Amino acid sequence: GAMVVNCGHVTAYGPGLTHGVVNKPATFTVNTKDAGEGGLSLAIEGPSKAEISCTDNQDGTCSVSYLPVLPGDYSILVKYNEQHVPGSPFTARVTGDD
Secondary structure, three states: OOOOOOOOOOEEEOHHHOEEEOOOOEEEEEEOOOOOOOOOEEEEEOOOOOOOEEOOOOOOEOOEEEOOOOOEEEEEEEEEOOEEOOOOOEEEEEEOOO
16 A cells, blocks of 8 residues: 555545535546646546536646536546546445435
8 A cells, every 4th residue: 555655646536536416516636746737537427427627726636526417326437648547437426315
């Protein structure tokens, strides 16, 4: 196992890779810390689809924002330069309220 002092050039983390909330915005964080200013990409699968928005900020992240509209096992596909990341895929288990 790794430590916090030796992490990779580009990472994806947060509760939005592993859980969800139907009809309220689901989010997680990505960080191109030695990879660059950005340029990575995503795709999301499941029983249903999402809009996969993002925000630039001033903190160096590529902050991802999506919206699950039906309860399900929403599979994140992270890619870095045309191929998948070292920990891909991920699966956001979205729970419902109605």
